């Protein structure tokens, strides 16, 4: 079960720029000392990406129903493990096979079923007076479930329930794709010390486990968790806190990318083919170093925007009886 | 537990087991050298592992020694028509053996029941647990042990000191179904042995190449299975053993 | 055991409330029919619906049962004043060689407002001291609802022995009443100077202390 | 028809219990009869079902060979015998009836149930009860009302009712439930409100009856003299 909120003020989302983000392994093979390019769903560099805030100091809490496209990029500079999990679905009315991948304090629960998703499912952490530790007690994610067939349990992972207002210390990236009904999850923890304007660093993403659900996903929505301290009366209407968090939502575009493989076998650089003419030349020549000279990348074709089809004077009808 | 258990059920209410999200091998069920009769219609008993079906329905019940020939399509009796009817397109796989050392005891073992009387026939693959007294005439009797109304359920005559045609035989039937759902339970391959430094042929789930297996000095990340090279040739496959 | 059910569900008086239970592929998903029962606290359970296709005599039509694959469903419309019971799902299991019920969920959640409690303290009599025991009683009455926390103290350390709490019952004026005993010995009854009964009800803390001497 | 069962019964931890299931009318010698239990804290279990026509026992694999259920055709009744009781047997049993049918499922349903037999076994067996008087003091009587009653202790087993003047008092009576102690003992109380103008002309007495103990104590209640 869930509860409704009241009308209050919020902050509008801003638009930032990415710097060499959205790179992962496009296959499950080993490559070294080879410059091979493929056609997969990646994120174009220097593109316009959305930015959503989650800090308290006010009362910023936005969780819209964004449409799920072919491949997404969810980067989160997580510090105190505020975001718990993510849900998926089409209409969220207990009619399709919705997804529920949450990361609790005991074990990861990946249950793809037909749960009754409410308008805003959020986790609740209450602060006890006797025990001086943050414990999760308000488990308001779904109402009930009628029938389900798929059920999988992932590996246990520890999480911190204490929320602070300091600077972030870690960075987590999440990539969700859906090809041939299979679900792909790319995640890797990279330590960093920054609040915004992510640097131009490079870090790959390795998959963990493939989920053959065999269904179509068109919408998605992230889940947020709040804390119930002694400063707030304890009601989730106008007094609450969320700590400090910032997540990025990006859409992967079907663009070819040239990857670099060293002797160790990890991804070092990523060169696009439809972003910059310099990178396009490095993409077609299959070399990271280009000398002086003239080359040919592609062609220039002007698509017609109008079509004039008409006749002089002919005018008649036709019977068929 | 379906084969080896402490006790079984009757024929009017038998155990129904479904094999889903699992995998098994029918090679051990053939070389047991402990079954009395083994009939498997619809498919060969030795060529049913390569081809697989969607679901497997297995039922377990007890039967006498003289009624083991009644489990077949194309005859009429007293048990094959009132307890479990066999259709024309019956591709089941029945297995029977003698285990009179567990379901028989001195004094008379009458634990399991059976149905003897019935109004009419029944559709195949249907369970009948109706304990209503079958009426043979046109007047009721309020369910008494008198005239014109007899109880259809009767006891058994199982005894460990009987002969060979009246002993409790553990009979099970393994039926197969071809539905629109993909085949879940099929036949898997096992691990025979490993040989290296010689030109051999292997099939590591993604290719079938002929060559040697030399000991490499590079360790791969624990998320890949294959490996290419500069010339775009798969020459490094991790051994899942 | 093999059948799991949610512990509690919520609903509104006028909306559709749907409850289900999940099992295995050998008891409910094999093909066996399900049976739903109602366990009222104070009477014997009766039959509501069998096979999810027929309607027995004496049961309303608002109950709807269906089987979606390997799980059953129960949907109702309208919450009357007789749904303060538990719902169990029953199906024939082959691995257990018999019938097995579910967990059971509670529909009623809460319908009790607050009020002002009143506690009285009665010391033991003179005839009870010769019985080699001391029963310190603490009666609470005229309060709502019946959810109180009983605590004891001896003016120097709270007591963590011999405490008990009796569930409150409904009075004739829609009120609750309860009592708490304290098993002690007369050897230590006269050594301590006083005894009290500390009770809290929505922040309201009322205190009453007696004196044996 | 209607099936009537026995009331409450308390036994020893390690003895045999003897209950029965009676049937009013007919439709008992033609259908199967099973026994379904229910305990506060967990779900409902199923021991087994017995047929009265053939007299065949059919229990479950979760219950061992410690309970025997018999049937009778002369008076159409059924008995239940269970020895070597434990601390978990504190529950209630029901005498249900089964009516089979035809279909693809063919599951056992319970259309007709019984009344119920409360079988509670614990320590602190039946002994001699003792009631203690209770009188108000000068500090507890500040207005025009008084509070007094009788306290019952070391009584066993349940149930035990309390009457005032052989039922002559109806307004202001309140009976408190029991509670499980550390030694398996129960304790109740009963207080009534009365004006202070009747404490010197009419006395209050408590009449406590006990059916399993065949005792009836009549103690007097008098106000305190020191306060
Ligand atoms: C690459 O480096 C990592 C981290 O040191 C090591 O775990 C891995 O074995 C290396 N892989 C190769 C191919 O050298
Ligand atoms: C028919 O042809 C004449 C001359 O080419 C032109 O002016 C006229 O518009 C035509 N008719 C139509 C309907 O276009
Ligand atoms: C297979 O099992 C062996 C030993 O049980 C283990 O060393 C190996 O890693 C396993 N292979 C897997 C899990 O792919």
Which ligand 2 atom minimizes the distance to the CA of A311? 14
CA distance C72 to chain D (A): 13
**Residue A257 C-alpha from the chain's centroid:** 19
Cβ atoms of C40 and C85 within 8 Å: the answer is yes
- For B111, other C-beta atoms within 10 Å of its C-beta total 19
* Structure tokens given for A140: 């308001």
Q: Classify residue C201 by its DSSP letter.
A: E
Interatomic CA distance for residues B122 and B143, integer angstroms: 23
- In the CATH scheme, what is the homologous superfamily, with its name and number, of domain C118-210? Immunoglobulins (2.60.40.10)
CA angle B12, B13, B17 (to 5 degrees): 135
Q: How far apart are CA B122 and CA B80, in angstroms?
A: 10
Task: Say how far apart CA C28 and CA C95 lie, in whole Å.
Answer: 12
Give CA–CA dist D129/B66, Å, rounded. 68
Q: Which long-range contacts (CB under 8 A, 24 or more apart) does D55-58 make?
A: D56/B110, D56/B111, D56/B113, D56/B155, D57/B111, D58/B111
Contact predicate A211/A185, CB 8 Å: yes
Buried b (16+ CB within 10 A) or exposed e, A174-212: bbbbbeeeebbbbebeeeeeeeeebeeebbbbbbeeebe
In a domain, A187, yes or no: yes
C66 CB-near residues (< 8 Å, 6+ apart): C52, C72, C73, C75
Q: What residue of C is the nearest CA neighbor of A147? A: C71
Q: Report chain A residues whose CB lies below 8 A from the CB of B227.
A: 29-31
D132, containing H or E segment: strand D130-134
First and final CA of chain C: distance in angstroms?
Answer: 58
Give the number of other Cβ atoms within 10 Å of residue A114's Cβ.
19
| DSSP character at residue C186 | H
Q: Which structure tokens are listed for A101? A: 């991948």
Closest CA to D13 of D67, D68, D82: D82
Task: Answer yes or no: CATH 2.60.40.10 is held by domain D2-121.
Answer: yes
Q: Is the residue at A2 inside a domain?
A: no
Neighbour count for residue A243 (Cβ, 10 Å): 20
Q: Is C26 on the interface with B (CB under 8 A)?
A: yes
Closest CA to B229 of A34, A39, A36, A260: A34
Asked if residue A56 is part of any domain, the answer here is yes
Q: How many angstroms separate the CA atoms of A58 and A82, rounded?
A: 17
CB contact under 8 Å between D43 and C50, yes or no, is no
Q: Among the atoms of ligand 2, which is closest to the Cα of residue A315?
A: 13
Name the token pair of A18: 């990415």
Tokens in use for A228? 């119930």
Classify residue C27 as exposed, middle or buried by CB count within 10 Å of its CB (0-12, 13-18, 19+): buried
CATH number of the domain where residue A138 is located: 2.60.120.960
> Are D48 and D69 a contacting pair, CB within 8 Å?
yes
Radius of gyration of chain D (CA): 24
Q: Tell me how far apart the alpha carbons of residues C102 and D46 are, in angstroms, rounded to a whole number.
A: 12
Give B240: exposed, middle or buried? Use CB within 10 Å, 0-12, 13-18, 19+. exposed
Residue B112 dihedral angles phi and psi, to the nearest 5°? -95, 150
Residue corresponding to tokens 């073992």: B109
Bridge partners for B102 per DSSP: none
Counting as contact any 3 or more CB pairs under 8 A, the partners of D are B, C
DSSP C163: B
Residue C72 phi/psi, 5-degree rounding, is -95, 165
Give the C-alpha separation, A179 to A184, whole Å: 8
Provide the phi-psi class of D184: left if phi over 0, else alpha when psi is between -120 and 50, else beta.
left
A-B contacts at Cβ under 8 angstroms: 37
Beta-carbon-side half-sphere exposure of residue B104 (alpha carbons within 13 Å): 20
- Tell me how long chain C is: 213
Overall number of domains in chain A: 1
Q: Is the dihedral of CA B117, B123, B129, B133 positive or negative?
A: negative
Does residue A183 form part of some domain? yes
List the Cα angle A254/A258/A259 in 5-degree steps. Answer: 115
- Please name the method used to determine this structure: cryo-EM
The total of other beta-carbon atoms located within 10 Å of residue B212's CB is 10
Pick the residue from chain B with its C-alpha nearest to C32.
B16
What span, in angstroms and rounded, lies between the C-alpha atoms of B38 and B59? 16
DSSP 8-state assignment for residue D137? -
- Resolution in angstroms comes to 4.8
Q: How far apart are CA A244 and CA A56, in angstroms?
A: 7
If DSSP codes are grouped into helix, strand and coil, which group holds residue D164? strand
Q: Where are the beta strands (DSSP E) in chain C?
A: 16-22, 34-39, 46-50, 64-68, 71-77, 86-93, 98-100, 105-106, 118-122, 134-135, 137-143, 149-153, 169-170, 176-180, 183-184, 195-201, 204-206, 209-210
Query: Going by C-beta distance under 8 Å and a sequence separation of 6 or more, which residues neighbour residue D213?
Result: D126, D128, D129
CB A114 within 8 A of CB A148: yes
Enter the CATH code of domain C8-108.
2.60.40.10
Task: At A211, give phi and psi (nearest 5°).
Answer: -110, 100
Question: Residue A315 Cα, ligand 2 centroid: separation in angstroms?
Answer: 11
Domain ranges of chain D: 2-121, 130-221
- Residues A42, A267: Cα–Cα separation, whole Å: 14
Q: What is the 3-state secondary structure (H, E, C) of chain A?
A: CCCCCCCCCCCCCEEEECCCCCCCCCCCEECCCCCCEEEEEECCCCCEEEEEECCCCCCCCCCCCEECCCCEEEEECCCCCCCCEEEEECCCCCCCCEEEEEECCCCEEECCECCCEEEEEEEEEEECCCCCCEEEEEEEEECCCCCCCCCEECCCCCCCCCCCCCCCCEEEEEEEEEECCEEEEEEEEEECCCCCCCCCCCCCCCECCCEECCCCCCEEEECCEEEECCCCCCCCCCCCECCCCEEEEEECEEEEEEEEECCCCCEEEEEECCCCHHHHHHHHCCCCCCCCCCCCCCCCCCCCCCCCCCCCCCCCCCCCC
For ligand 1, say whether the CB of B219 is within 6 Å of any of its atoms. yes
For residues D179-207, b (16+ Cβ closer than 10 Å) or e, as one string?
beeeeebbbbbbbbebeeeebeeeebebb
Please tell me the total number of residues recorded for chain D in this structure. 227
| Cβ proximity of D43 and C102 under 8 Å | yes
Closest among A187, A252, A272 to A22, alpha carbons compared:
A252
Q: Ligand 2 pocket test: pick from A313, A314, A315, A316 the residue with the most ligand atoms within 8 Å of its Cβ.
A: A313
Torsion of CA C54, C58, C62, C66, to 10 degrees: -30
Cβ within 8 Å of residue B44, ≥6 positions away? none
Residue ranges per structural domain of chain C: 8-108, 118-210
Triad A301, A304, A306: Cα angle to 5°? 170
A286 has a chain B CB within 8 A of its CB: no
Paired tokens of D54: 């053939």
Contacts of C19 in chain A (CB under 8 A): 144
A166 within a domain of the structure (yes/no): yes
Can you tell me which residue has the tokens 């350390």?
C157
Maximum Cα–Cα distance across chain C: 75
Q: Is chain C adjacent to chain A, meaning 3+ CB pairs within 8 angstroms? A: yes
CA dihedral A196, A200, A201, A203 (to 10 degrees): 90
| Cis amide linkage into residue D116, ω under 30° from 0 | no
CB contact, 8 Å: A1 with chain C?
yes
- Check the CA dihedral D103-D105-D108-D112 and report its sign: negative
Ligand 2, atom 5: closest residue by C-alpha: A312
Spatial separation of the C-alpha atoms in residues C71 and C52, rounded to whole Å: 12
Determine the straight-line distance between the first and last CA of chain A, rounded to whole angstroms: 65
Domain that holds residue A175: 14-298
Position A318 in a domain: no
Per the CB < 8 A criterion, the answer to whether D80 and D93 are in contact is yes
3-state class of D196 per DSSP? helix
Which residues are CB-neighbours of A281 under 8 A, at least 6 positions away? A290, A295, A297
Superfamily of domain D130-221 in the CATH hierarchy? Immunoglobulins (2.60.40.10)
């Amino acid at each position: 079960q869930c509860v409704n909120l009241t009308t209050r003020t919020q902050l509008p989302p801003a638009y930032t720029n990415s710097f060499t983000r959205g790179v992962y392994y496009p296959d499950k093979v080993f490559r070294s000392s080879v410059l091979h390019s493929t056609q997969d769903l990646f994120l174009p560099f220097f593109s316009n990406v959305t930015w959503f805030h989650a800090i308290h100091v006010t009362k910023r809490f936005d969780n819209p129903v964004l449409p799920f496209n072919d491949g997404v990029y969810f980067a989160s500079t997580e510090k105190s493990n505020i975001i718990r999990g993510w849900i998926f679905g089409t209409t969220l009315d207990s009619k399709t096979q919705s997804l529920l991948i949450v990361n609790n304090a005991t074990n990861v629960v990946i249950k793809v079923c037909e749960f009754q998703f409410c308008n805003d499912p959020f986790l609740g952490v209450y602060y006890h007076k006797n025990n001086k530790s943050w414990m999760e007690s308000e488990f308001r994610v779904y109402s009930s479930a009628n029938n389900c067939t798929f059920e999988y349990v992932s590996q246990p992972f520890l999480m911190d329930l204490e929320g602070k207002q300091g600077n972030f210390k870690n960075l987590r990236e999440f990539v969700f794709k859906n090809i041939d009904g299979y679900f792909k999850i790319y995640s890797k923890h990279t330590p960093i010390n920054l609040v915004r304007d992510l640097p131009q660093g490079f870090s790959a993403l390795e998959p963990l486990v493939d989920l053959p659900i065999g269904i179509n996903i068109t919408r998605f929505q992230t889940l947020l968790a709040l804390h119930r301290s002694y400063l707030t009366p304890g009601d989730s209407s106008s007094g609450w806190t969320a700590g400090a968090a910032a997540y990025y939502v990006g859409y992967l575009q079907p663009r070819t990318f040239l990857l670099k493989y060293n002797e160790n076998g990890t991804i070092t650089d990523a060169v696009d083919c439809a972003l910059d003419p310099l990178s396009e030349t490095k993409c077609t020549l299959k070399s990271f170093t280009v000398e002086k000279g003239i080359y040919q990348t592609s062609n220039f074709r002007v698509q017609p925007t109008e079509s004039i089809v008409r006749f002089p004077n002919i005018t008649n009808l036709c019977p068929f009886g | 537990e379906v084969f080896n258990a402490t006790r079984f059920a009757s024929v009017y209410a038998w155990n129904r087991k479904r094999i889903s999200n699992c995998v098994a091998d029918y090679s051990v069920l053939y070389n047991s050298a402990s079954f009395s009769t083994f009939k498997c219609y619809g498919v060969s008993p030795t060529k049913l592992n390569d081809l697989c079906f969607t679901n497997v329905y297995a039922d377990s019940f007890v039967i006498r020694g003289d009624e083991v020939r009644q489990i077949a399509p194309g005859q009429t009796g007293k048990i094959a028509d009132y307890n479990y009817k066999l259709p024309d397109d019956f591709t089941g796989c029945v297995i029977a053996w003698n285990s009179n050392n567990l379901d028989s005891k001195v004094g008379g073992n009458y634990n399991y029941l059976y149905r003897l009387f019935r109004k009419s026939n029944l559709k195949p693959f249907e369970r009948d647990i109706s304990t209503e007294i079958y009426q043979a005439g046109s007047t009721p009797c309020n369910g008494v042990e008198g005239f014109n109304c007899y109880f259809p359920l009767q006891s058994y005559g199982f005894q460990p000191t009987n002969g060979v045609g009246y002993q409790p035989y553990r009979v099970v039937v393994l039926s197969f179904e071809l539905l629109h759902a993909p085949a879940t339970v099929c036949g898997p391959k096992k691990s025979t042995n490993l040989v290296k430094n010689k030109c051999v042929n292997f099939n590591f789930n993604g290719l079938t190449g002929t060559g040697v297996l030399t000991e490499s000095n590079k360790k791969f990340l624990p998320f890949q299975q294959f490996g290419r090279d500069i010339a775009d040739t798969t020459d490094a496959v991790r051994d899942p053993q | 055991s093999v059948l799991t059910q949610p512990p509690s569900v919520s609903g509104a008086p006028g909306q559709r409330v749907t409850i289900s239970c999940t099992g295995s592929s050998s008891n409910i998903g094999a093909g066996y029919d399900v049976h739903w029962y109602q366990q009222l606290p104070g009477t014997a359970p009766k039959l509501l619906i069998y096979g999810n296709s027929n309607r027995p005599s004496g049961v309303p039509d608002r109950f709807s049962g269906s089987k979606s694959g390997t799980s059953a469903s129960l949907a109702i419309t309208g919450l009357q004043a007789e749904d303060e019971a538990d719902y169990y799902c029953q199906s024939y299991d082959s691995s257990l060689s018999g019938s097995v019920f579910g967990g059971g969920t509670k529909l009623t959640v809460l319908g009790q407002p607050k009020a002002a409690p009143s506690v009285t303290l009665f010391p033991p009599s003179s005839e009870e001291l010769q019985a080699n025991k001391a029963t310190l009683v603490c009666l609470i009455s005229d309060f709502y609802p019946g959810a109180v926390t009983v605590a004891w103290k001896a003016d120097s350390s709270p007591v963590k022995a011999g405490v008990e709490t009796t569930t409150p019952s409904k009075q004739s004026n829609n009120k609750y009443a309860a009592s708490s005993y304290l098993s002690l010995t007369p050897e230590q009854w006269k050594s301590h100077r006083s005894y009290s009964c500390q009770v809290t009800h929505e922040g309201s803390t009322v205190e009453k202390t007696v004196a044996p001497t | 028809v209607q099936l009537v069962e026995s009331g409450a019964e308390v036994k020893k931890p390690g003895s045999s219990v003897k209950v029965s299931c009676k049937a009013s009318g007919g439709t008992f010698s033609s259908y199967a009869i099973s026994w379904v239990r229910q305990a506060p804290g967990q779900g409902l279990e199923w021991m087994g079902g017995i047929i009265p026509i053939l007299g065949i026992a059919n229990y479950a694999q979760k219950f061992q060979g410690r309970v025997t259920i018999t049937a009778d055709k002369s008076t159409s009744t059924a008995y239940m015998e269970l020895s070597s009781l434990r601390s978990e047997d504190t529950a209630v049993y029901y005498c249900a009836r089964e009516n089979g049918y035809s279909g693809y499922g063919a599951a056992a349903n319970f259309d007709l149930w019984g009344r119920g037999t409360l079988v509670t076994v614990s320590s602190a067996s039946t002994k001699g009860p003792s009631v203690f008087p209770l009188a108000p003091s000068s500090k507890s009587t500040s207005g025009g009302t008084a509070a007094l009653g009788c306290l019952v202790k070391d009584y066993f087993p349940e149930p035990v009712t309390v009457s005032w003047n052989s039922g002559a008092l109806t307004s202001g009576v309140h009976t408190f439930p029991a509670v499980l102690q550390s030694s398996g003992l129960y304790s109740l109380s009963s207080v009534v409100t009365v004006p202070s103008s009747s404490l010197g002309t009419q006395t209050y007495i408590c009449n406590v009856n006990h059916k399993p103990s065949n005792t009836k104590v009549d103690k007097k209640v008098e106000p305190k003299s020191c306060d």
